[PDB]
């Protein structure tokens, strides 16, 4: 990719992409998981991503993590989540392909895979160092508390408490698989969480559509419950791009659902990168960096991106230039008045490859 | 204390308690003081604690600290505070045994012991590195400003300025002791602070109480002036405990008013601790860590705990398990359907001895 | 300057002043510039300052910086700014001598000097590590993106792109200089920013006036656009001082507009400093530190000062001593009742010279 400056792409810059599709899965009993955060992807400071899969009847046990909020995109299949708030309120809900969930910092939750196939989902966390091996597990908790005290807390005999796990369980296919949603009632009288904490992203109408190119956006404006995180789906036709832009107020974490994605990134100071991502690869654009993404393949492209802010903010190059008077633009770009008037006058979000 | 996993208590973790009652006092003319923060209790990042006493007519001098808010519980005796806000408003007030005060970051204040006893109190600060040696003292200030400038600001002669203290006074019993409260009038016309910055804690009705065990809570709901911080009193009968829980949004700092406390802290990744606290000893429980406290002794237990958030938030293991369906629970704990049904169905905050 | 404690001024403290007047200017085509941040003035953590000048028709090119907000005071002459918000809204306005602007983090902007002489202004940033060499330049941007993508984004030929600059332009005088304000119209339909992002500071009625001494203040109350930054103008007569005070909620950055300033700073634990600043020199007071400033010269003094909070808070030694009862003051200062009653009973903010 030639550039007007001949910058050596990548030089003096952290990687902005990670070959996540090549990270080995860690295997569990009815589940798989891998993760990418600052520990292996140094640039990714504000967010970490976790791939996880659950089979039918496999649960990611009751756990919490106060150091991070959990935003989720279900890529395939069907899950059921439970979520319990600091106010004793609960949500028990199904989330399917294209659905989101948001677990506020430190709230207890679980995720179970419901049949017939395997649920596969992404979990993005608003803390770059987050690791699925440093969550707080209830099985770990109760097995690391004096037995007498657990007996007292539960009102149980030693023989009863003795049947609890002896260490963190993490993922379980011990059973039973959960029944129909309507029957999944709390064992004790419990007030329902009323602000929705799941949401349907994929089935939204596009916010923007231009010759096949599509953007669906879920910010606090459409998913108020995810109050400080936003996510979007972009669909890119062959040859098309998301125009050049930057986000004033957020980092952008990316994952390629299918296709091949070219991403370019401008730090300041004459430094910049460009590079390709395969299906299942990950990208990260730090707050304020200029960037753009192009589909250079023969096939369509789908990615999900996530921002660590509930208020989606974008300034496109075109919008920016369009807002300035000729004189300013001509002076900045040092170009003839004839060329000046040919700068962008409106902002179409995507840009098309040239027409037949 | 046996566990299911036979975990070695304390292995791979910092101390969650500090033998404060063994920390020596520093002595002043009319008061005494000691402190615990990250400098001697490394885990205590979110809060630091100071113990202080004031003889009658001794005063903690006018000072300020922009780097920390000051939240207080009066353990014994009676005090009088003054407090001056950025809008030139003042509160002059009494705080007795069981009373709170909150001094917003950088607002000026003073504390005096009124009669007829020794006032003893705890100051808790939302900054673990806070040090009583690092306050901005007005006596220190004027003695460290150029004489000429002090003359000008006060409109005083060299001989008048000459009589000010030569270095930080800190605590003084020079006098006079203070008059009745209705006579403690500002020397100049000064508007009064209207949102209360003191509060009565010990005197509240128990928020929750079961079989003699009681919890008194002062969050921003009951003490809005303390917008930033929350305080609580727990009284625990022999053999009883606060249930297993964690706090999603805050660190917990603890002091033992009287009795003996057993504290357990579980830190994740198979690590956990359990230990005893004598009276006057201090505990700290990092945000989000699971914990519980228990009275394992023949006498009663009384402690004050403080959170660095004004919105008290708790998830009790019981509420949590109660909120979940049979299947999820059974599958998680890998126990039988019959045992599953015997998991908590309600949360009584405390658990009684069986 | 003698003191009651005989403190060795400066000892165990960082410099609270910086000889900015003697920092070499970096020369551009019709513009000059120099800067002070933590890189050369270690104490200045919360705010960095930039001096800049533009000739008629010299523009500081279209750029942005998400890492910091921009508060400006115009010292001499006249400028025009443009500011584009995350919602494709624009303000295009003139800012003349004594006027402010505020550019929110990561909003895109530009500054042109308009006639007739040299525009001279201060830029204060709410990040003490900000450096004018690390902004995001639109020209740098476009010369560091794949050419084919610049083509597609702009709907332009390779021939047309070859005309754009080849590296960061920074300051341009290529022209044309901008025309009358009413003709400075955006090149494409752009809604206007409705909340004013400029403000007349020097033109304000003084907030406080005592025997020639005057403070003019622009917090969020008079300039709500500058939501988290405050600026003030202090005029100080020969012999006069700003009373001893501290700010509970903000650091203070100071620049000497003309005259000769004296700053004392008190830093806790028997440590304090005092020193002189010449015109063009810079002062910094960390939050909470006790301070006062005095004019010890035979002529007048003018400073601008900036705060990294939109809510102005000051507690004066006088307001404070005034609000306590005699017993408290007497006991604290260890002095006779007689003397106690002669402490301040009101607050005039300045103090007139008391030397006979
Ligand atoms: Mn989780
Ligand atoms: Mn983007
Ligand atoms: Mn204090
Ligand atoms: Mn607790
Ligand atoms: Mn700028
Ligand atoms: Mn000041």
Tab-separated table of C-alpha atoms in Angstrom, chain A:
chain	number	residue	atom	x	y	z
A	1	UNK	CA	0.000	0.000	0.000
A	2	UNK	CA	1.866	3.144	-1.195
A	3	UNK	CA	1.379	6.328	0.897
A	4	UNK	CA	2.203	9.958	0.042
A	5	UNK	CA	4.906	9.955	2.734
A	6	UNK	CA	6.390	6.471	2.246
A	7	UNK	CA	6.046	5.888	5.970
A	8	UNK	CA	7.398	2.493	7.011
A	9	UNK	CA	4.127	0.985	8.213
A	10	UNK	CA	4.209	-0.159	11.819
A	11	UNK	CA	7.622	1.417	12.524
A	12	UNK	CA	7.791	2.831	16.117
A	13	UNK	CA	4.290	1.556	16.932
A	14	UNK	CA	2.793	-1.253	18.995
A	15	UNK	CA	0.830	-3.899	17.089
A	16	UNK	CA	-2.858	-2.932	16.571
A	17	UNK	CA	-3.863	-6.410	15.560
A	18	UNK	CA	-3.565	-9.807	17.203
A	19	UNK	CA	-3.691	-13.187	15.544
A	20	UNK	CA	-6.398	-14.324	17.966
A	21	UNK	CA	-7.693	-16.952	15.518
A	22	UNK	CA	-4.405	-18.747	16.111
A	23	UNK	CA	-4.404	-18.652	19.907
A	24	UNK	CA	-4.979	-22.226	21.229
A	25	UNK	CA	-8.254	-22.922	23.051
A	26	UNK	CA	-8.074	-24.024	26.685
A	27	UNK	CA	-10.419	-26.992	27.039
A	28	UNK	CA	-13.067	-27.566	29.764
A	29	UNK	CA	-15.797	-30.127	30.334
A	30	UNK	CA	-18.367	-28.933	27.779
A	31	UNK	CA	-16.655	-25.625	27.107
A	32	UNK	CA	-13.701	-23.853	25.504
A	33	UNK	CA	-12.143	-20.404	26.077
A	34	UNK	CA	-9.228	-18.170	25.053
A	35	UNK	CA	-8.449	-14.556	25.845
A	36	UNK	CA	-6.565	-11.477	24.643
A	37	UNK	CA	-5.594	-8.534	26.904
A	38	UNK	CA	-2.467	-6.486	27.739
A	39	UNK	CA	-0.589	-9.650	28.852
A	40	UNK	CA	-0.247	-10.770	25.195
A	41	UNK	CA	-1.540	-7.725	23.295
A	42	UNK	CA	0.342	-4.812	24.841
A	43	UNK	CA	-1.594	-1.936	23.157
A	44	UNK	CA	-5.037	-3.133	24.291
A	45	UNK	CA	-5.104	-1.203	27.625
A	46	UNK	CA	-8.761	-0.233	28.052
A	47	UNK	CA	-10.420	-3.531	27.025
A	48	UNK	CA	-9.794	-7.306	26.932
A	49	UNK	CA	-11.627	-9.889	24.842
A	50	UNK	CA	-12.556	-13.458	25.712
A	51	UNK	CA	-13.826	-16.128	23.344
A	52	UNK	CA	-15.909	-18.760	25.085
A	53	UNK	CA	-18.090	-21.689	23.997
A	54	UNK	CA	-20.565	-23.789	25.951
A	55	UNK	CA	-22.278	-26.968	24.891
A	56	UNK	CA	-25.837	-27.921	25.755
A	57	UNK	CA	-26.154	-28.205	29.520
A	58	UNK	CA	-22.730	-26.778	30.226
A	59	UNK	CA	-22.624	-23.845	32.622
A	60	UNK	CA	-19.951	-21.231	33.337
A	61	UNK	CA	-20.510	-21.372	37.120
A	62	UNK	CA	-21.801	-18.559	39.356
A	63	UNK	CA	-19.001	-15.985	39.549
A	64	UNK	CA	-18.246	-12.252	39.892
A	65	UNK	CA	-15.497	-9.777	39.097
A	66	UNK	CA	-15.593	-6.279	40.562
A	67	UNK	CA	-12.570	-5.025	38.598
A	68	UNK	CA	-14.437	-5.250	35.220
A	69	UNK	CA	-17.792	-4.922	33.441
A	70	UNK	CA	-18.775	-7.645	30.960
A	71	UNK	CA	-20.332	-6.817	27.558
A	72	UNK	CA	-21.229	-9.783	25.365
A	73	UNK	CA	-21.979	-10.701	21.786
A	74	UNK	CA	-23.429	-14.152	21.055
A	75	UNK	CA	-21.960	-15.366	17.724
A	76	UNK	CA	-23.829	-18.724	17.470
A	77	UNK	CA	-26.465	-20.760	19.311
A	78	UNK	CA	-28.410	-20.000	22.499
A	79	UNK	CA	-27.395	-19.059	26.023
A	80	UNK	CA	-29.177	-18.424	29.287
A	81	UNK	CA	-27.781	-15.883	31.736
A	82	UNK	CA	-28.562	-15.140	35.344
A	83	UNK	CA	-27.605	-11.775	36.887
A	84	UNK	CA	-27.988	-10.636	40.502
A	85	UNK	CA	-27.714	-6.970	41.576
A	86	UNK	CA	-26.414	-5.305	44.813
A	87	UNK	CA	-30.115	-4.717	45.470
A	88	UNK	CA	-31.151	-8.393	45.508
A	89	UNK	CA	-32.741	-8.084	42.050
A	90	UNK	CA	-32.369	-10.762	39.353
A	91	UNK	CA	-32.636	-11.260	35.602
A	92	UNK	CA	-32.883	-14.721	34.102
A	93	UNK	CA	-32.878	-14.491	30.342
A	94	UNK	CA	-32.118	-16.143	27.035
A	95	UNK	CA	-29.675	-14.480	24.675
A	96	UNK	CA	-29.368	-15.847	21.139
A	97	UNK	CA	-27.190	-15.258	18.088
A	98	UNK	CA	-26.961	-11.492	17.603
A	99	UNK	CA	-27.916	-10.766	21.221
A	100	UNK	CA	-25.983	-8.802	23.850
A	101	UNK	CA	-25.693	-8.932	27.607
A	102	UNK	CA	-24.095	-6.504	30.043
A	103	UNK	CA	-22.982	-7.499	33.512
A	104	UNK	CA	-22.187	-4.441	35.661
A	105	UNK	CA	-18.932	-4.534	37.704
A	106	UNK	CA	-19.091	-7.016	40.594
A	107	UNK	CA	-22.608	-8.331	39.931
A	108	UNK	CA	-22.985	-12.082	40.315
A	109	UNK	CA	-23.860	-13.945	37.107
A	110	UNK	CA	-23.819	-17.290	35.241
A	111	UNK	CA	-24.032	-18.421	31.597
A	112	UNK	CA	-25.465	-21.722	30.435
A	113	UNK	CA	-25.609	-23.166	26.903
A	114	UNK	CA	-29.054	-24.317	25.838
A	115	UNK	CA	-29.524	-26.938	23.062
A	116	UNK	CA	-29.355	-28.253	20.538
A	117	UNK	CA	-26.029	-26.813	19.352
A	118	UNK	CA	-22.966	-25.170	20.847
A	119	UNK	CA	-23.189	-21.580	22.017
A	120	UNK	CA	-20.229	-19.432	21.000
A	121	UNK	CA	-19.921	-15.873	22.267
A	122	UNK	CA	-17.543	-12.946	22.778
A	123	UNK	CA	-16.986	-11.254	26.117
A	124	UNK	CA	-15.408	-7.813	26.086
A	125	UNK	CA	-14.273	-6.361	29.407
A	126	UNK	CA	-13.593	-2.727	30.291
A	127	UNK	CA	-10.221	-3.501	31.833
A	128	UNK	CA	-7.285	-4.434	29.635
A	129	UNK	CA	-5.775	-6.823	32.137
A	130	UNK	CA	-8.857	-8.921	32.745
A	131	UNK	CA	-8.338	-12.694	32.810
A	132	UNK	CA	-10.873	-15.499	32.937
A	133	UNK	CA	-8.562	-17.139	35.479
A	134	UNK	CA	-8.939	-14.384	38.039
A	135	UNK	CA	-12.679	-14.309	38.487
A	136	UNK	CA	-14.358	-14.884	41.819
A	137	UNK	CA	-15.942	-18.321	41.854
A	138	UNK	CA	-18.626	-19.381	44.291
A	139	UNK	CA	-17.290	-22.983	44.383
A	140	UNK	CA	-13.830	-21.591	45.139
A	141	UNK	CA	-15.286	-19.240	47.750
A	142	UNK	CA	-17.195	-21.852	49.729
A	143	UNK	CA	-14.228	-24.278	49.530
A	144	UNK	CA	-11.916	-21.568	50.874
A	145	UNK	CA	-14.032	-20.554	53.891
A	146	UNK	CA	-13.868	-22.242	57.302
A	147	UNK	CA	-16.234	-25.210	57.233
A	148	UNK	CA	-17.904	-24.331	60.548
A	149	UNK	CA	-18.694	-20.859	59.128
A	150	UNK	CA	-20.259	-22.276	55.945
A	151	UNK	CA	-22.318	-24.630	58.067
A	152	UNK	CA	-23.568	-21.616	60.047
A	153	UNK	CA	-24.230	-19.496	56.926
A	154	UNK	CA	-26.227	-22.246	55.208
A	155	UNK	CA	-27.644	-23.912	58.322
A	156	UNK	CA	-26.076	-27.226	57.219
A	157	UNK	CA	-24.574	-30.348	58.849
A	158	UNK	CA	-20.945	-31.326	58.213
A	159	UNK	CA	-22.184	-34.195	55.987
A	160	UNK	CA	-24.060	-31.695	53.826
A	161	UNK	CA	-21.282	-29.119	53.455
A	162	UNK	CA	-18.970	-32.081	52.738
A	163	UNK	CA	-20.689	-32.589	49.403
A	164	UNK	CA	-19.643	-29.185	48.069
A	165	UNK	CA	-16.775	-28.806	45.587
A	166	UNK	CA	-13.242	-28.720	47.010
A	167	UNK	CA	-11.978	-26.099	44.571
A	168	UNK	CA	-12.982	-23.736	41.760
A	169	UNK	CA	-15.313	-25.527	39.334
A	170	UNK	CA	-15.193	-22.934	36.573
A	171	UNK	CA	-17.278	-24.810	33.923
A	172	UNK	CA	-19.657	-27.676	34.720
A	173	UNK	CA	-21.527	-30.282	32.669
A	174	UNK	CA	-22.449	-32.168	35.806
A	175	UNK	CA	-26.140	-31.298	35.304
A	176	UNK	CA	-29.008	-30.960	35.071
A	177	UNK	CA	-29.402	-28.923	31.893
A	178	UNK	CA	-31.933	-26.190	32.559
A	179	UNK	CA	-35.576	-26.609	31.477
A	180	UNK	CA	-37.883	-24.141	29.679
A	181	UNK	CA	-37.389	-20.425	30.488
A	182	UNK	CA	-40.781	-20.088	32.259
A	183	UNK	CA	-39.720	-22.836	34.756
A	184	UNK	CA	-36.335	-21.281	35.621
A	185	UNK	CA	-37.688	-19.610	38.753
A	186	UNK	CA	-35.430	-18.491	41.658
A	187	UNK	CA	-35.331	-20.921	44.561
A	188	UNK	CA	-36.228	-18.021	46.895
A	189	UNK	CA	-38.643	-15.086	46.473
A	190	UNK	CA	-36.606	-12.535	44.473
A	191	UNK	CA	-37.476	-9.174	42.909
A	192	UNK	CA	-36.942	-9.038	39.143
A	193	UNK	CA	-34.362	-6.639	37.644
A	194	UNK	CA	-36.403	-4.186	35.578
A	195	UNK	CA	-33.877	-2.271	33.493
A	196	UNK	CA	-33.123	-4.776	30.671
A	197	UNK	CA	-29.593	-6.180	30.791
A	198	UNK	CA	-29.752	-8.129	27.544
A	199	UNK	CA	-30.482	-6.629	24.117
A	200	UNK	CA	-30.907	-7.543	20.497
A	201	UNK	CA	-28.164	-5.987	18.369
A	202	UNK	CA	-28.144	-8.080	15.186
A	203	UNK	CA	-31.872	-7.683	14.606
A	204	UNK	CA	-31.792	-3.882	14.780
A	205	UNK	CA	-32.492	-1.902	11.650
A	206	UNK	CA	-29.229	-0.567	10.237
A	207	UNK	CA	-28.387	2.880	11.596
A	208	UNK	CA	-26.631	3.466	8.264
A	209	UNK	CA	-26.934	1.629	4.946
A	210	UNK	CA	-25.109	2.504	1.713
A	211	UNK	CA	-25.118	0.110	-1.253
A	212	UNK	CA	-25.042	-3.030	0.926
A	213	UNK	CA	-22.780	-1.568	3.596
A	214	UNK	CA	-24.448	-1.548	7.020
A	215	UNK	CA	-23.871	-0.327	10.565
A	216	UNK	CA	-25.935	-1.351	13.572
A	217	UNK	CA	-25.052	0.480	16.768
A	218	UNK	CA	-25.974	-0.240	20.365
A	219	UNK	CA	-24.981	2.581	22.695
A	220	UNK	CA	-26.531	3.741	25.968
A	221	UNK	CA	-29.066	5.389	23.663
A	222	UNK	CA	-30.471	1.971	22.652
A	223	UNK	CA	-29.208	-0.218	25.465
A	224	UNK	CA	-29.246	2.064	28.494
A	225	UNK	CA	-28.326	-0.850	30.755
A	226	UNK	CA	-24.904	-1.104	29.191
A	227	UNK	CA	-24.419	2.402	30.550
A	228	UNK	CA	-20.677	2.821	29.851
A	229	UNK	CA	-20.023	0.469	26.918
A	230	UNK	CA	-21.127	0.511	23.262
A	231	UNK	CA	-20.971	-2.125	20.515
A	232	UNK	CA	-21.689	-2.134	16.804
A	233	UNK	CA	-21.869	-4.500	13.851
A	234	UNK	CA	-20.370	-3.430	10.526
A	235	UNK	CA	-21.053	-5.277	7.263
A	236	UNK	CA	-18.703	-4.374	4.387
A	237	UNK	CA	-19.243	-5.207	0.714
A	238	UNK	CA	-16.147	-6.098	-1.369
A	239	UNK	CA	-14.133	-2.944	-2.148
A	240	UNK	CA	-15.910	-0.677	0.339
A	241	UNK	CA	-14.578	1.071	3.431
A	242	UNK	CA	-15.610	2.792	6.660
A	243	UNK	CA	-14.431	6.348	6.015
A	244	UNK	CA	-11.469	7.872	7.858
A	245	UNK	CA	-12.415	8.940	11.374
A	246	UNK	CA	-11.412	9.103	15.029
A	247	UNK	CA	-13.323	8.690	18.298
A	248	UNK	CA	-12.788	11.579	20.767
A	249	UNK	CA	-13.888	9.708	23.875
A	250	UNK	CA	-13.299	5.945	23.530
A	251	UNK	CA	-11.029	3.066	22.597
A	252	UNK	CA	-12.263	0.641	19.890
A	253	UNK	CA	-11.823	-3.127	20.225
A	254	UNK	CA	-12.539	-5.227	17.117
A	255	UNK	CA	-13.249	-8.815	16.159
A	256	UNK	CA	-13.697	-10.246	12.673
A	257	UNK	CA	-16.823	-12.383	12.554
A	258	UNK	CA	-16.052	-13.528	8.971
A	259	UNK	CA	-14.196	-12.266	5.889
A	260	UNK	CA	-10.855	-10.416	5.803
A	261	UNK	CA	-10.471	-6.906	7.112
A	262	UNK	CA	-7.806	-4.332	6.289
A	263	UNK	CA	-7.260	-1.796	9.061
A	264	UNK	CA	-5.150	1.348	9.023
A	265	UNK	CA	-4.222	3.399	12.049
A	266	UNK	CA	-2.690	6.819	12.475
A	267	UNK	CA	-0.878	7.670	15.772
A	268	UNK	CA	0.453	11.153	15.564
A	269	UNK	CA	4.014	12.119	14.595
A	270	UNK	CA	4.180	10.568	11.155
A	271	UNK	CA	3.627	7.053	12.493
A	272	UNK	CA	1.021	4.703	11.028
A	273	UNK	CA	0.171	1.073	10.330
A	274	UNK	CA	-1.928	-0.957	7.967
A	275	UNK	CA	-2.468	-4.722	8.070
A	276	UNK	CA	-4.935	-7.549	7.506
A	277	UNK	CA	-7.116	-9.505	9.910
A	278	UNK	CA	-8.472	-12.993	9.296
A	279	UNK	CA	-11.771	-14.331	10.617
A	280	UNK	CA	-11.477	-14.461	14.395
A	281	UNK	CA	-8.590	-11.990	14.577
A	282	UNK	CA	-8.665	-8.975	16.870
A	283	UNK	CA	-8.024	-5.253	16.396
A	284	UNK	CA	-7.628	-2.305	18.809
A	285	UNK	CA	-7.684	1.437	18.068
A	286	UNK	CA	-6.608	3.676	21.000
A	287	UNK	CA	-8.759	6.711	21.820
A	288	UNK	CA	-8.234	9.584	19.370
A	289	UNK	CA	-6.181	7.682	16.800
A	290	UNK	CA	-7.191	8.207	13.190
A	291	UNK	CA	-8.343	5.075	11.447
A	292	UNK	CA	-10.324	3.452	8.630
A	293	UNK	CA	-11.190	-0.075	7.608
A	294	UNK	CA	-11.424	-1.521	4.091
A	295	UNK	CA	-12.630	-4.822	2.630
A	296	UNK	CA	-10.048	-5.757	-0.013
A	297	UNK	CA	-11.249	-9.332	-0.494
A	298	UNK	CA	-13.627	-10.775	-3.078
A	299	UNK	CA	-16.070	-11.689	-0.286
A	300	UNK	CA	-18.272	-9.863	2.263
A	301	UNK	CA	-16.894	-8.855	5.679
A	302	UNK	CA	-18.490	-8.750	9.175
A	303	UNK	CA	-16.997	-7.397	12.354
A	304	UNK	CA	-18.200	-6.496	15.808
A	305	UNK	CA	-16.568	-3.515	17.523
A	306	UNK	CA	-16.898	-2.393	21.129
A	307	UNK	CA	-16.164	0.973	22.788
A	308	UNK	CA	-15.405	1.618	26.444
A	309	UNK	CA	-17.956	4.367	26.598
A	310	UNK	CA	-21.765	4.491	26.643
A	311	UNK	CA	-21.854	7.489	24.358
A	312	UNK	CA	-20.802	6.759	20.795
A	313	UNK	CA	-18.767	9.624	19.347
A	314	UNK	CA	-17.267	9.785	15.833
A	315	UNK	CA	-15.763	12.575	13.758
A	316	UNK	CA	-15.393	11.490	10.106
A	317	UNK	CA	-12.755	13.124	7.973
A	318	UNK	CA	-15.419	14.158	5.492
A	319	UNK	CA	-17.690	15.745	8.119
A	320	UNK	CA	-14.703	17.625	9.467
A	321	UNK	CA	-13.488	18.984	6.133
A	322	UNK	CA	-17.075	19.781	5.022
A	323	UNK	CA	-17.468	22.053	8.049
A	324	UNK	CA	-14.533	24.341	7.155
A	325	UNK	CA	-14.449	27.255	4.667
A	326	UNK	CA	-12.429	27.039	1.422
A	327	UNK	CA	-9.704	29.373	2.582
A	328	UNK	CA	-8.877	27.276	5.699
A	329	UNK	CA	-8.803	24.015	3.706
A	330	UNK	CA	-6.699	25.434	0.858
A	331	UNK	CA	-4.251	26.837	3.400
A	332	UNK	CA	-4.032	23.624	5.386
A	333	UNK	CA	-3.637	21.354	2.400
A	334	UNK	CA	-1.623	23.910	0.364
A	335	UNK	CA	-3.630	23.172	-2.791
A	336	UNK	CA	-5.175	25.282	-5.572
A	337	UNK	CA	-8.643	26.791	-5.102
A	338	UNK	CA	-9.922	24.484	-7.942
A	339	UNK	CA	-8.883	21.405	-5.954
A	340	UNK	CA	-10.166	22.898	-2.679
A	341	UNK	CA	-13.801	22.926	-3.821
A	342	UNK	CA	-13.463	19.242	-4.591
A	343	UNK	CA	-12.994	18.280	-0.932
A	344	UNK	CA	-15.869	16.435	0.768
A	345	UNK	CA	-19.150	18.311	1.139
A	346	UNK	CA	-21.147	15.611	2.974
A	347	UNK	CA	-20.508	12.475	4.973
A	348	UNK	CA	-21.749	9.075	3.779
A	349	UNK	CA	-19.989	7.005	6.525
A	350	UNK	CA	-18.945	4.287	4.083
A	351	UNK	CA	-17.191	4.902	0.767
A	352	UNK	CA	-17.879	2.826	-2.360
A	353	UNK	CA	-15.459	1.368	-4.896
A	354	UNK	CA	-15.825	3.195	-8.209
A	355	UNK	CA	-19.076	2.452	-10.162
A	356	UNK	CA	-19.589	0.637	-13.563
